[PDB]
Amino acid sequence: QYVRIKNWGSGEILHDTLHHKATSDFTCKSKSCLGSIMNPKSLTRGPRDKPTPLEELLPHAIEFINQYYGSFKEAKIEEHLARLEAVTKEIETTGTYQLTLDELIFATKMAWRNAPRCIGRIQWSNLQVFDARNCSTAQEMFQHICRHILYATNNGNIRSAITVFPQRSDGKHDFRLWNSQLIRYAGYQMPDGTIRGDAATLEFTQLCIDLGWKPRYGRFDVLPLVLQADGQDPEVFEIPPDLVLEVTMEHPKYEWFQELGLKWYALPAVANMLLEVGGLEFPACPFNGWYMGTEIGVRDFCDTQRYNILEEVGRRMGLETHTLASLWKDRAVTEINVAVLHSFQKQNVTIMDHHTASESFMKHMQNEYRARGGCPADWIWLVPPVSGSITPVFHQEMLNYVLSPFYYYQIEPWKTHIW
Amino acid sequence: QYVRIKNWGSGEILHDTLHHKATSDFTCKSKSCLGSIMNPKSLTRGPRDKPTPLEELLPHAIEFINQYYGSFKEAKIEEHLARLEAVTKEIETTGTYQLTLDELIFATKMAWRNAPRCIGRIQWSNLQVFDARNCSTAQEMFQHICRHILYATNNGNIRSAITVFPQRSDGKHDFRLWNSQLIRYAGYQMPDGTIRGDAATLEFTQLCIDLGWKPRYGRFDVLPLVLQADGQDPEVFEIPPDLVLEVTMEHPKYEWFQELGLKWYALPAVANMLLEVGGLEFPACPFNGWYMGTEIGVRDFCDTQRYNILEEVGRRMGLETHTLASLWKDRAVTEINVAVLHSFQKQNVTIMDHHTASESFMKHMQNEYRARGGCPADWIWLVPPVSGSITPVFHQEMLNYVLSPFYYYQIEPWKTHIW
Ligand code: HEM
Ligand code: HEM
Ligand SMILES: C[C@H](O)[C@H](O)[C@H]1CNc2nc(N)[nH]c(=O)c2N1
Ligand SMILES: C[C@H](O)[C@H](O)[C@H]1CNc2nc(N)[nH]c(=O)c2N1
Ligand SMILES: CCCNC(=[NH2+])NCCC[C@H](N)C(=O)O
Ligand SMILES: CCCNC(=[NH2+])NCCC[C@H](N)C(=O)O
Ligand SMILES: [Zn+2]
Numbered sequence: 001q002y003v004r005i006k007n008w009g010s011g012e013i014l015h016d017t018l019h020h021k022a023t024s025d026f027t028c029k030s031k032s033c034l035g036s037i038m039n040p041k042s043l044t045r046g047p048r049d050k051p052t053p054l055e056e057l058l059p060h061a062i063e064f065i066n067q068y069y070g071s072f073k074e075a076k077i078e079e080h081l082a083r084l085e086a087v088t089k090e091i092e093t094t095g096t097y098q099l100t101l102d103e104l105i106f107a108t109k110m111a112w113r114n115a116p117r118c119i120g121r122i123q124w125s126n127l128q129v130f131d132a133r134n135c136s137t138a139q140e141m142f143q144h145i146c147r148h149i150l151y152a153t154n155n156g157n158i159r160s161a162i163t164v165f166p167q168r169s170d171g172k173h174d175f176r177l178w179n180s181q182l183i184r185y186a187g188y189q190m191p192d193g194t195i196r197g198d199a200a201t202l203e204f205t206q207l208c209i210d211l212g213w214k215p216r217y218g219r220f221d222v223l224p225l226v227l228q229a230d231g232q233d234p235e236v237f238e239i240p241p242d243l244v245l246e247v248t249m250e251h252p253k254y255e256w257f258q259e260l261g262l263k264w265y266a267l268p269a270v271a272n273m274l275l276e277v278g279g280l281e282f283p284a285c286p287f288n289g290w291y292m293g294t295e296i297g298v299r300d301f302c303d304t305q306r307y308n309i310l311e312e313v314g315r316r317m318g319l320e321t322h323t324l325a326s327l328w329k330d331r332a333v334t335e336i337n338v339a340v341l342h343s344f345q346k347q348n349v350t351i352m353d354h355h356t357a358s359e360s361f362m363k364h365m366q367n368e369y370r371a372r373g374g375c376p377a378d379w380i381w382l383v384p385p386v387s388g389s390i391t392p393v394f395h396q397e398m399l400n401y402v403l404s405p406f407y408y409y410q411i412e413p414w415k416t417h418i419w
Numbered sequence: 420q421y422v423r424i425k426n427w428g429s430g431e432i433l434h435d436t437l438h439h440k441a442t443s444d445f446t447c448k449s450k451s452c453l454g455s456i457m458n459p460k461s462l463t464r465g466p467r468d469k470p471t472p473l474e475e476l477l478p479h480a481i482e483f484i485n486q487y488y489g490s491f492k493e494a495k496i497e498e499h500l501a502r503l504e505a506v507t508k509e510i511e512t513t514g515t516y517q518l519t520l521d522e523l524i525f526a527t528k529m530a531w532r533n534a535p536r537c538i539g540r541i542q543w544s545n546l547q548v549f550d551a552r553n554c555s556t557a558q559e560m561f562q563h564i565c566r567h568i569l570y571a572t573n574n575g576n577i578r579s580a581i582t583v584f585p586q587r588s589d590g591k592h593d594f595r596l597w598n599s600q601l602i603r604y605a606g607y608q609m610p611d612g613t614i615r616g617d618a619a620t621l622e623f624t625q626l627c628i629d630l631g632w633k634p635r636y637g638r639f640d641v642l643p644l645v646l647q648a649d650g651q652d653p654e655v656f657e658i659p660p661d662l663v664l665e666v667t668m669e670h671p672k673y674e675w676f677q678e679l680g681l682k683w684y685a686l687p688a689v690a691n692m693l694l695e696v697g698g699l700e701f702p703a704c705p706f707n708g709w710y711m712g713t714e715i716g717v718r719d720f721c722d723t724q725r726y727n728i729l730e731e732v733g734r735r736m737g738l739e740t741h742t743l744a745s746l747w748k749d750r751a752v753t754e755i756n757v758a759v760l761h762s763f764q765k766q767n768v769t770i771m772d773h774h775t776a777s778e779s780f781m782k783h784m785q786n787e788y789r790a791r792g793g794c795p796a797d798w799i800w801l802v803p804p805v806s807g808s809i810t811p812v813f814h815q816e817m818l819n820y821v822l823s824p825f826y827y828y829q830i831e832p833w834k835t836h837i838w
Contacts, residue, residue: 003453009723019451028447028454032438033819034422035447035454036798298808304428310809325772327757329809334749341744353744379455380798385808389717390729390748394804400452 002373009395018374022401035400036380045274045281045408047416048171051095057279061087061097064278064405067110068103096169098133099277105129107277108162108287111405117381119357119393120289122364127287128152128161135165135175138227138235145225145286146243149182152288153245153267158350162287166230167280173231175284178413179223180204182269182286183244186221197221199305207414211236219307220246220263233419247347251339256316260309264296264340266349272413277405287407290350292357297337298385309336333386354384358391365396376401421792428814437793441820454819455799464693464700464827466835467590470514476698480506480516483697483824486529487522515588517552518696524548526696527581527706530824536800538776538812539708541783546706547571547580554584554594557646557654564644564705565662568601571707572664572686577769581706585649586699592650594703597832598642599623601688601705602663605640616640618724626833630655638726639665639682652838666766670758675735679728683715683759685768691832696824706826709769711776716756717804728755752805773803777810784815795820 002015027040034040065087069080090097099107105127113124128151132144148163165175186205187197195202197219205223209215213224213236222244225237245266251257269288274281302310310332314321317335319328337353344351361382368375377398388394421434446459453459484506488499509516518526524546532543547570551563567582584594605624606616614621616638624642628634632643632655641663644656664685670676688707693700721729729751733740736754738747756772763770780801787794796817807813 003451006457008457011724022450025449026447026452028445028452030444030449031441031820032422033445033447033452033454033797034816035452035819036816038425038427038816303808303814305430305814324774324778325760327753327760327772327774329774330753330756330806333806333809334746334753337749338746341746353746355743355746355748359743378452383807385813386806387749387752388802388807389722389804390752395722395724397453397455397457400454401450 003399005397005399007392007396009392014369016369016374016399018368018372018376018403019399019401021403023404024402026401035378039409042402043409044411045276046411047174048168048281051170052279052281054091054095057096058088058091060279060404061091064103064107068106071106096167096280097278099280101129101131103278104131104133104164107405108164108275108285111275111277111407112287114376114403114406116376116378116400116402119292119361119382120352121375122360122367123160123289124364126160128159130161130163132163132165133167136230138229138232138237141165141175141177141227141229141284142225142237145177145182145227146240148286148288149239149243149267149269152269153243156245156266156347156349158266158288158290160287160289162285164275164282165284167282174228175230176228176234176410176413177271177284177286178204178207178226178228178234179271182225182271182288183239183265183267184223185219185265186215186223188215188217190217198300198307208236219261222265228413228417233417234413245349247343247349249339249343250346251335252342254316254335254339257313257339260312260316262301262307262309262339264300266291266344268295270407272410274408274410275405276408283410290352291344292352292354292384293337293341293344294354294384294386297340298333301336301340302333337386354387355391358384358393362392362396365398374399376403422818424816424818426811426815428811433788435788435793435818437787437791437795437822438818438820440822442823443821445820454797458828461821462828463830464695465830466593467587467700470589471698471700473510473514476515477507477510479698479823480510483522483526487525490525515586515699516697518699520548520550522697523550523552523583526824527583527694527704530694530696530826531706533795533822533825535795535797535819535821538711538780538801539771540794541779541786542579542708543783545579547578549580549582551582551584552586555649557648557651557656560584560594560596560646560648560703561644561656564596564601564646565659567705567707568658568662568686568688571688572662575664575685575766575768577685577707577709579706579708581704583694583701584703586701593647594649595647595653595829595832596690596703596705597623597626597645597647597653598690601644601690601707602658602684602686603642604638604684605634605642607634607636609636617719617726627655638680641684647832647836652836653832664768666762666768668758668762669765670754671761673735673754673758676732676758679731679735681720681726681728681758683719685710685763687714689826691829693827693829694824695827702829709771710763711771711773711803712756712760712763713773713803713805716759717752720755720759721752756805773806774810777803777812781811781815784817793818795822 002017005014027034027042087097152161185198187199187201226234228234246263249262268291271286274283275285301307314328314332320326365375378400379398383394421436424433446453446461506516571580604617606618606620645653647653665682668681687710690705693702694704720726733747733751739745784794797819798817802813
């Protein structure tokens with residue numbers, strides 16, 4: 001039956017039945033809870049050595065095809081049954097199968113719809129799908145990505161999109177983007193122990209250098225694309241500068257803000273996740289949506305492990321930077337968030353504030369429970385890194401489980417690659 | 420073995436072995452996660468009808484006695500073995516047993532030390548224990564509580580303390596405080612649909628009225644003590660006003676802040692939890708520590724389901740109160756937090772800001788892993804309702820499990836009481 005779920009802000013009660021359709025075991029044990037683990041094996045889908053067993057594949061394929069045709073208003077049994085038969089024959093004859101374009105589209109949106117850590121899921125149906133399942137070379141990958149970045153950016157009017165490269169076969173010819181995001185700044189560990197740029201890309205940045213890339217040693221040096229096609233070693237490609245849209249940071253009151261020399265890319269695109277559907281796994285499917293202010297303002301700029309600009313902004317605000325109890329951090333981070341939002345709007349780059357994001361997600365979660373009696377949600381990721389209880393999602397109890405289709409994490413390509 | 424746990428702010432890794440000592444099953448399933456549930460049955464310890472089975476009691480009692488004597492630097496096998504024998508005889512002869520004062524003290528501090536939702540646990544060893552296991556009447560309960568409130572308040576220099584009433588026997592003669600907190604404001608649903616006071620005490624407040632208490636219908640009317648002794652019906656007692664220390668709210672810049680007419684009690688004391696130790700359950704053991712700013716500033720004052728004063732403060736700050744994306748809520752809530760801290764310090768009432776609290780907890784969590792290879796922690800409760808990622812605990816992965824001794828929740832007394 002259903003798990004009773006409550007919203008303490010409204011007192012509203014919901015019944016989750018959808019959690020029944022969950023697959024394998026999640027992160028938490030029978031007597032313990034590992035919900036605050038960032039990368040649990042339950043959310044990861046690693047390497048392959050041989051094809052996936054027919055006994056396993058077929059059952060999943062049937063289920064997905066059933067899910068697909070099931071999502072239709074006005075059924076099509078005929079086509080449905082015909083498709084079931086066709087897929088079976090294909091698995092029998094080929095050892096796998098191919099999704100129709102419409103099923104891929106459906107699958108990409110469902111996997112998004114089933115992403116528990118995503119707060120923008122109310123947009124799940126508005127998604128552009130670029131079919132690159134035909135791709136054969138890295139150069140071709142590079143071309144597909146450039147087309148993706150260009151379409152997505154749309155001169156600042158960001159559009160959600162995903163590019164689907166070839167599915168995994170024997171797992172010995174994997175298409176993979178060694179990048180965590182299509183566009184990201186490099187991090188360099190200076191000779192003086194210092195760190196210039198984004199400390200989070202330190203390892204990858206060093207990899208790019210090892211792959212022959214030339215380090216510019218700047219705080220905001222966009223990293224190269226490191227593409228691996230058909231199991232082949234990775235080839236490094238520079239992204240055409242004209243394609244990378246950026247926003248320079250400035251505050252609508254503090255004119256000294258510009259003097260910080262801050263900026264960020266406008267396109268947030270996850271590059272290293274794997275799409276799972278009907279038995280199939282796509283280890284290469286970069287997708288993107290648009291930014292939520294706090295991602296840049298709070299995390300990227302203020303994380304102690306990222307740009308860490310919070311004390312500097314505090315000093316320039318003339319705050320009691322040495323009195324933790326003065327709440328100067330609360331003050332600074334809020335002004336940084338205003339700079340980030342204001343700067344995007346000014347330059348006409350689509351962005352969304354955390355309050356608005358939280359509010360729309362609640363609307364979505366309600367549609368979901370009403371539509372399919374549930375919505376997989378990770379409270380720990382869905383609550384903004386600032387203003388927690390000030391947002392409605394904080395007061396909402398939720399269930400986190402892995403359905404299918406789904407976007408999994410993967411093991412760092414350079415850790416599991418036979419050069 | 421150990422569960423590897425990481426802190427993404429420092430990159431530091433920890434090994435949790437302590438989770439091994441966990442008892443029953445927690446909240447989360449094998450394929451689902453219910454970590455965001457406020458009141459899971461795994462954290463609740465309900466009513467009793469008959470004594471607790473000797474087969475169950477004895478094993479737990481032995482374990483606790485072993486834990487107790489084990490916590491000693493320089494062992495005392497002799498006394499240890501002697502105590503094991505004495506407790507056994509007692510269970511055999513009486514059908515239960517009594518803890519020595521020192522074991523009760525030890526047990527109250529361990530149960531605190533084992534509270535995953537508590538951020539002040541670095542103070543776990545500094546706790547005053549008032550032994551009221553001899554109490555027989557409500558009047559006596561009322562006297563013990565008054566003594567507790569007086570000792571704890573200490574004219575503003577708050578001291579942590581707990582009062583332990585008689586343990587449960589057959590569960591048909593339970594000592595219980597029908598209150599959620601020793602000191603709390605009443606909530607009244609006005610005739611006009613409105614709500615005056617604290618909306619969170621609406622039901623209880625109505626109960627008090629039903630028990631003959633006279634409603635003053637004010638925004639800050641301290642509620643009466645509703646004590647139930649030896650299974651007897653609850654008797655209502657007014658708390659001596661002189662004993663309830665309060666702080667009037669005022670901002671160190673906005674002089675209009677006082678015009679809001681806000682104030683809060685200085686003593687946060689949980690009244691309705693149950694202490695569990697060596698097979699024994701104490702359904703009545705009010706305890707207290709001191710406030711952390713955000714509890715009042717963010718939750719009590721700004722929760723939409725509490726006093727909900729956030730838009731009013733926003734208007735009086737002249738903020739774009741109708742433009743959610745302006746981040747006015749971030750601005751107001753921060754000033755309210757400054758009012759709350761400033762007002763407590765001004766009136767010399769012990770209080771702690773969330774930044775300082777988060778920092779000390781990290782120090783504690785480190786002592787714990789180093790001391791006993793673990794620390795049960797609920798990330799969802801331990802992260803402040805504001806400034807999330809700005810605090811170190813947000814970047815710390817943690818394991819949540821129920822050890823013993825432990826402070827459990829209980830079912831609302833008025834739901835399970837034979838009048
Ligand atoms: C259109 C607006 C969108 C917004 C505003 C949005 C917002 C977010 C945010 C705030 C995160 C948190 C990232 C972090 O904290 O590191 C996230 C994660 C995620 N989103 Fe969305 N999202 C959007 C679109 C998408 C799209 C188009 C997809 C996929 C087709 C998607 C899939 C996911 C997944 C899988 C994660 C998890 C990433 C991870 O675990 O690192 N999102 N999203
Ligand atoms: C001395 C300083 C203390 C501080 C600053 C502190 C702080 C906190 C805070 C912030 C909460 C959150 C309450 C909420 O959000 O509703 C909490 C919960 C809790 N604390 Fe502590 N605490 C302190 C002392 C104590 C003491 C003395 C005990 C017990 C002997 C204790 C046991 C617990 C327990 C069981 C909870 C859970 C309450 C619930 O689930 O509603 N704390 N504490
Ligand atoms: C340890 C903890 O799980 C980790 O810091 C999480 C918390 N919540 C988060 N939420 C989002 N959206 N993104 C993150 O990176 C994190 N980090
Ligand atoms: C739904 C969710 O569990 C609930 O709102 C929690 C979140 N974290 C919390 N954390 C603390 N300290 N106190 C609370 O009351 C809550 N409420
Ligand atoms: C990839 C689609 C979802 N994208 C998104 N809203 N942001 C999450 C990734 C960007 C990352 N949080 C950053 O600020 O660097
Ligand atoms: C009871 C000991 C722990 N107390 C404490 N620090 N606060 C939690 C209870 C008070 C509650 N959060 C309130 O602001 O109304
Ligand atoms: Zn869990």
